[PDB]
């Protein structure tokens, strides 16, 4: 059965698309305002050398801190998000931040050479750039695999904005107080996404693949948290981060 999208579901999609268009820059025009990327010789991928230099950390921390601010703005526009207590809103944003960033970064990701391409060679990011920020292969290798699998879904922008919203409004995040309200908000979004796929996505299982990507994001989130903790132990690391990054991941 292929029910039509209701007037409410149409309204939810239009709000999320408008929210995304106002909070995501496909021209990466603010990147010149971040602390500059610095790339040093690290062919071997030496953990000791990367931790001693963290050459790409100020730039990548700025990239993530900037994206968190945009995610905060996007979330405020999600239907029902403002009905939650401020406490539940902050818990949801903090716990989903890196996951949402991983979804948002897919637009700049290219399979032509397996990089996030955001302009000239300066704003072109590969596996080596993430390792230069103090992260290790247990995160970056499944991260590239995630980016490819996600890119291959060829998501409509409507499905992309619904997936980010569903990711943020998750009742199974630790520290949430009103899980039932969060679940009702998420179910309204999930039903919108499911209805949308069934009547707008042409042939040739997409919904189940999108749900699996959400489970993949949980694994990546946990590994990122473990890696951020190691990184935070490096002396003088806090100056290479930002106050927002310190709060969200600390
Ligand atoms: C460089 C790869 C990646 C992939 C998701 C990334 C960037 C930083 C970190 C790691 C972060 C940190 O752990 C750090 F700094 F400590 F090492 C922490 F989370 F704590 F900050 C990680 C794992 C991945 C990234 C993120 C956002 C954008 C990206 C794409 C597009 C846009 C434009 C827009 O959103 O409007 C954008 F701002 C950013 C781009 C192009 C790449």
From Swiss-Prot:
One of its GO terms (molecular function) is nuclear retinoid X receptor binding. Keywords: Cytoplasm, Disease variant, DNA-binding, Metal-binding, Nucleus, Receptor, Transcription, Transcription regulation, Ubl conjugation, Zinc, Zinc-finger. Residues 76-94 are annotated as: Interaction with coactivator LXXLL motif. One of its GO terms (biological process) is apoptotic process involved in mammary gland involution. A motif (9aaTAD) lies at residues 243-250. Composed of three domains: a modulating N-terminal domain, a DNA-binding domain and a C-terminal ligand-binding domain. This is Vitamin D3 receptor. It comes from Homo sapiens. The gene is VDR. The chain holds residues 120 to 423 of 427 of the full protein.
